[model samples]
Target: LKPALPDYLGNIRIILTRTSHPANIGSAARAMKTMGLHRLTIVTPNLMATPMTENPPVFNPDDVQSFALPEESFILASGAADVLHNAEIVATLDEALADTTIACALTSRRRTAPLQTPRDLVPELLQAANRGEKVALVFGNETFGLSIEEVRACNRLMTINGNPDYFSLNLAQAVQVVCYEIFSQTDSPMTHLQQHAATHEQIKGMLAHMESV
Candidate 1:
């Protein structure tokens, strides 16, 4: 049987573009999984050149496998291995978010003139998802953030509220903060999740390392 997902999570999806690190992908999934956001799509990731299927020549989940995943990712994801197993890989952002009705680009520094902080967009994002709108939250690569064109493609650009001079939040940390906010706004309490969950704040701090994809 499929694991039951939350209703709000159903209306929203997460997308990462040109990711350079597999561990970041795994940690992002871990972050989303912890906060009840499960839909993850990766665009043009640099981990594996091609998708791994049930082929003979290049198939191996154990080692030398090109499932777009290195052992490091699974190691980092920890309890969220299921999220990693269920993640999708796509060729482009267009295909990744094809079904999305609202797209929000998560960027540390946007090329656009103005940008909304993730804190400000929380209510709106939650509302959009709550309204059954297929919302897409997009993140850029590790080295450089999204481009001006990419930012323009999204409905709006969102930034994390942190030190202005030192904006070095990574992919997984951003995902954690955003996902935590979404969960915070939910009417559903996490007590039930507590039976199987941990101190989320501690986990959040643990993933604050400068790493990304």
Candidate 2:
């Protein structure tokens, strides 16, 4: 029998679209590290390289490097270094989601279109991720959330629950919250059994025989 633990945390990739600040990127790296996740792929980040003379407004290079090391170490332990090392800076949303199996757009406000409440969709997302699915958590620019077309591409959407009128969350905070949930669900013991049963080919053969029609 497989130990009751999830195999992967749904490939929690963070896509920052048109991020204008390095500090936010650095902070996001820190956020992901704290939760034991390092699959962060920045999309068209404001600063590709640390500026020598000009101070970066988005992130402090030293601070970002500090977070990346430990997080990379953790990911290496999980044999996911390729995902971490190959974390790319894509040019567009379509490029990011092109090969992904499950795509989720994160936002703060409730848009005009209907969305899956966090409560209802969190479990489903975890299940999909445990099945070795490539998932992308798309976040929009600092000032504006994901565009409607971007949201439409996603199979589901998530938003942090806060005060009805004044519930605005920064992009980093939103990433932190969503990443935490994804980690927790995937690390849960219940989800692990399901994953093991699905992946063990020999066991699958036996089960197939039992269910033969």
Candidate 3:
């Protein structure tokens, strides 16, 4: 029922790092799927962690039920459950980005040296993806955000560039913003916008009929 998307969209990967909330993953997956982005990777999500657990906790993927996500995830994913279900679960950021040519970390930090907005950087990212290069868009945890190490690991940096005074976007909202930018540039055909115009002959025929009546 959906129109075919650009092939390059397949080369773009959405990687969520140490996600604290399982529902955020689902929401992010839904956000990606809405923009025709299917590739998703989750690196060492803190699914089981809580405030009562060790501060700066050690999360071993094997110790928990690694494959099982909570009901909240499926509930939030809604129609995009496939994207959530097929998400790649990994232990490290390196593993998630192993095959990607360019890794763009999504950060709000002012001191990240140089950072491009999603609108500015997406064109270049799409260009790379069009050339069959895998591009990873890395998003970090809800609470702590991306670590310095993770930020440095990415070759490129991107920011949403909302109002600096009140610059707060939730994990899923950030994903939606970036994904929408990517989608807008894909040149997806909007058949619904195509309207049929009345020809000159048809207009004249209608006028004649009205006069005769």
Off by over 4 Å in 3: 1-3, 48-59, 62-65, 188-213
RMSD of each: 13.3, 10.4, 18.0
Instruction: Tell how far residue 132 is off in model 1, in angstroms.
Output: 1.8
Write down the lDDT of every candidate, Cα atoms only.
0.69, 0.60, 0.79
Residues 8-66, candidate 1: write the lDDT tens digits: 67777888877767778878988998889888887766553323212212223243235
Candidate 3, position 71, lDDT: 70
Candidate achieving higher lDDT, 1 or 2: 1
Number of the top-ranking candidate, with TM-score as the measure: 3
TM-score of each: 0.72, 0.65, 0.79
Highest-scoring model, lDDT: 3
Model 2 per-residue lDDT tens digits across residues 122-196:
677666666666667788878767777777766667766778877767877787787677666654444445432
Kindly indicate the candidate among 2 and 3 with the higher lDDT: 3
lDDT of 3 by residue, 53-146 (tens): 2332345667634366667777788999999778888887877877677789988764838889988898878877776768889999898889
Worst 10 residues of 1 by lDDT: 191-200
Is candidate 2 or 3 superior in TM-score?
Answer: 3
